[PDB]
Amino acid sequence: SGFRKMAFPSGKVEGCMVQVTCGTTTLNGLWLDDVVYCPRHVICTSEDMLNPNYEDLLIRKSNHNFLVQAGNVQLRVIGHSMQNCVLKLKVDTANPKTPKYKFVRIQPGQTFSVLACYNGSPSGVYQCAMRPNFTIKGSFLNGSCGSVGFNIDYDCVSFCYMHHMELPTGVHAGTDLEGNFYGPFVDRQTAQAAGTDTTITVNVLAWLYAAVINGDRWFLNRFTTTLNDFNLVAMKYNYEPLTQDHVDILGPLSAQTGIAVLDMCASLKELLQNGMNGRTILGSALLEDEFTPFDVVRQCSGVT
Amino acid sequence: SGFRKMAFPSGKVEGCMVQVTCGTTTLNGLWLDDVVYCPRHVICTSEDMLNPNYEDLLIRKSNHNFLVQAGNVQLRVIGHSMQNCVLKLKVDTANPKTPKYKFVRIQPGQTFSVLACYNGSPSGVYQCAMRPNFTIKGSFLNGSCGSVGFNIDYDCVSFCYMHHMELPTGVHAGTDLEGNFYGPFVDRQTAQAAGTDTTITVNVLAWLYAAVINGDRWFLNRFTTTLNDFNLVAMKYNYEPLTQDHVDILGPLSAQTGIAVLDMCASLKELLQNGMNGRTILGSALLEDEFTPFDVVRQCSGVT
Ligand SMILES: CN1CCN(C(=O)Nc2ccccc2)CC1
Ligand SMILES: CN1CCN(C(=O)Nc2ccccc2)CC1
Numbered sequence: 001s002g003f004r005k006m007a008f009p010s011g012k013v014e015g016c017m018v019q020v021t022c023g024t025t026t027l028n029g030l031w032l033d034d035v036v037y038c039p040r041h042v043i044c045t046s047e048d049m050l051n052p053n054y055e056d057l058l059i060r061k062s063n064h065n066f067l068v069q070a071g072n073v074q075l076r077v078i079g080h081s082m083q084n085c086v087l088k089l090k091v092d093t094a095n096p097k098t099p100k101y102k103f104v105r106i107q108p109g110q111t112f113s114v115l116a117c118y119n120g121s122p123s124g125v126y127q128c129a130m131r132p133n134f135t136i137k138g139s140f141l142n143g144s145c146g147s148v149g150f151n152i153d154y155d156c157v158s159f160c161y162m163h164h165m166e167l168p169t170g171v172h173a174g175t176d177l178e179g180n181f182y183g184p185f186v187d188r189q190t191a192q193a194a195g196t197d198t199t200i201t202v203n204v205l206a207w208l209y210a211a212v213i214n215g216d217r218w219f220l221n222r223f224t225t226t227l228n229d230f231n232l233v234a235m236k237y238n239y240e241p242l243t244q245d246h247v248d249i250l251g252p253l254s255a256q257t258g259i260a261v262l263d264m265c266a267s268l269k270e271l272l273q274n275g276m277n278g279r280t281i282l283g284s285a286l287l288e289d290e291f292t293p294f295d296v297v298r299q300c301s302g303v304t
Numbered sequence: 305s306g307f308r309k310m311a312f313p314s315g316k317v318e319g320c321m322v323q324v325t326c327g328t329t330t331l332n333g334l335w336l337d338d339v340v341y342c343p344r345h346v347i348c349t350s351e352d353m354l355n356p357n358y359e360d361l362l363i364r365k366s367n368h369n370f371l372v373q374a375g376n377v378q379l380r381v382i383g384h385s386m387q388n389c390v391l392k393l394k395v396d397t398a399n400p401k402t403p404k405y406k407f408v409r410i411q412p413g414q415t416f417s418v419l420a421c422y423n424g425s426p427s428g429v430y431q432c433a434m435r436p437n438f439t440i441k442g443s444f445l446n447g448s449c450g451s452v453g454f455n456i457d458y459d460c461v462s463f464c465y466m467h468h469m470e471l472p473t474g475v476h477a478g479t480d481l482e483g484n485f486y487g488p489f490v491d492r493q494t495a496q497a498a499g500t501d502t503t504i505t506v507n508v509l510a511w512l513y514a515a516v517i518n519g520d521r522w523f524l525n526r527f528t529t530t531l532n533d534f535n536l537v538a539m540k541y542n543y544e545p546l547t548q549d550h551v552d553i554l555g556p557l558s559a560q561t562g563i564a565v566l567d568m569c570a571s572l573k574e575l576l577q578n579g580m581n582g583r584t585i586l587g588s589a590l591l592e593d594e595f596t597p598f599d600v601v602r603q604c605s606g607v608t
Contacts, residue, residue, distance in 0.1 A: 001444070001445075001470055001474040002442045002443040002444060002470075002474060002476065004418075004420075004428075004430040004432075005309060005430060006420065006428035006429065006430045006443060007429050007430065008428060008429070009314045009315070009318050009427075009429055010314050011313070011314055011315025011316075011319065011426075014313050014315040114308075115313065116308075116310065116606075118606045118608050119608065122315075122608060123310075123602075123603075123608045124308075124603065125311050125312070125429060126309060126311065128308075137306055137587060138306045139306040139307055139308035139310060139603060140305070140306060141305075141605075141606040142606075143606060144606070166305055166306075170305040170306060170518065171306075172306065215474055275582070280590065283441060284588075285580075285588070285590040286584065286588075298427075299427075299428065300445075301445075302422045302427055302445040302448070304421070304423065304426060304427045
């Protein structure tokens with residue numbers, strides 16, 4: 001029993017983190033097989049970051065200008081190609097600790113673990129969500145760029161995020177491992193403002209199921225509702241619309257708890273309309289939206 | 305920028321997790337050098353757990369009755385001794401992945417990472433605190449016993465917790481690695497009720513410093529207070545008393561922020577007396593007490 005914001009074990013990813021240095025800029029890289037992945041803005045001075053022409057900047061760089069260090073051993077760079085907003089540095093040694101892996105572009109509302117790194121060294125690990133406005137609310141200081149987000153499926157690591165940017169508003173933007181930014185963000189130091197940070201409604205409902213399962217039940221009401229009724233209320237509170245797909249995904253939690261999904265929606269509606277009145281749910285005073293229904297099934301069943 | 309509930313990288317600890325089976329009971333063990341540490345209630349049937357005489361139960365057990373599996377390779381048990389509420393199983397092989405380590409008995413209010421395991425396999429990692437009533441609010445299902453709490457100091461892992469018990473109230477009790485329970489708890493299935501779960505006041509203040517540092521400032525008031533005045537208010541709200549030691553520990557955050565510790569106390573006093581009025585601080589609607597001042601210095605400085 002008990003319900004925690006829980007990251008995946010980071011060890012498989014620790015074993016992939018390296019330091020990448022280009023001139024004066026040092027940041028993190030991901031060593032998988034004989035390729036090191038890192039943000040292409042490694043080739044930028046902070047001055048460059050105002051109006052960087054990455055192709056032009058790259059002409060001046062050789063393989064020997066990219067210093068790649070895995071612990072205290074240097075990796076030889078034998079090639080590099082810019083793929084979108086990532087550099088792929090080919091090195092002459094395959095990472096002996098390469099786990100089984102995929103690159104997956106996640107959808108907004110999807111959760112993942114971040115291993116925050118500095119100089120190719122892990123500082124810590126925490127569970128995030130891709131917000132509906134394609135930002136993440138990370139913890140990232142200077143040197144954290146190249147820090148990655150991942151999921152683990154038994155022994156396969158699916159890398160979904162590489163950290164690139166902090167917006168002037170202190171939220172974070174980055175890419176998939178093909179170097180495509182999530183949302184409208186670019187690796188430029190400029191006015192980029194995130195859209196509305198909506199609540200991930202399906203994740204809130206899953207978390208309400210996790211609460212009931214762990215004994216926090218005070219918020220269960222006598223009411224039900226409909227998707228359309230629920231959604232009129234959701235929208236007014238900057239919650240994402242709930243779809244039949246969302247209802248289908250919550251099915252198992254519904255079955256296990258014997259609480260219909262629309263009944264729970266109607267519990268959630270009253271919480272929105274009436275607030276918590278100083279009460280808490282799994283030790284939170286607001287409605288948590290960074291657990292997916294899969295996260296809730298996983299942690300309430302003990303998947304390893 | 306940004307502030308996250310952040311666990312240590314779990315990889316050094318992943319490499320120590322094994323499965324221990326005695327008859328029908330399977331749970332987790334910690335393999336360091338040629339010793340595997342696990343909860344002594346591995347020798348108990350759920351029936352035993354009502355009124356277990358561990359010495360008597362142990363007479364009937366041989367080295368060959370303790371099945372120790374590290375991945376899919378069995379470890380030979382060549383000896384075992386009961387030390388308090390832990391079994392130490394001597395095995396003929398030293399764990400090749402043994403990191404630098406200590407056993408440290410932590411104080412209440414101290415934070416640590418848990419690597420939740422099932423059958424010697426890590427499921428996830430999360431940051432806890434030892435509550436002032438010596439419970440932790442964990443996430444632990446059947447088979448999680450032997451899951452450990454730790455801190456990392458660069459490359460040294462200080463193991464502080466081994467998980468043993470869930471109280472009837474769904475909070476967790478366990479031991480240091482010498483097998484001494486934190487607080488008044490025993491490995492018996494009975495009426496054990498935790499005391500008052502007080503708020504770790506020094507941790508709240510550190511978190512208020514982390515907020516200011518990350519730009520959340522709305523709660524900064526024009527007032528100051530004194531330790532005695534603050535404490536009259538603290539006590540009424542089931543906050544731990546604040547001591548000069550606590551003030552001394554907050555010194556660096558005070559220096560960095562230029563907010564005197566007693567000024568921040570007086571901000572915290574108004575928060576207690578006036579609530580949040582529907583506002584949030586680092587995306588929380590209550591006052592977080594599971595970051596130590598050291599945690600706040602660490603994450604705001606990027607220690608690896
Ligand atoms: C911008 N360019 C792109 C091409 N390029 C390479 O090095 N390519 C390469 C890739 C894999 C192995 C060997 C060489 C130089 C920089
Ligand atoms: C309860 N007893 C305690 C003694 N004991 C041992 O095996 N001790 C041992 C320790 C280290 C190496 C070899 C033997 C049996 C069970």
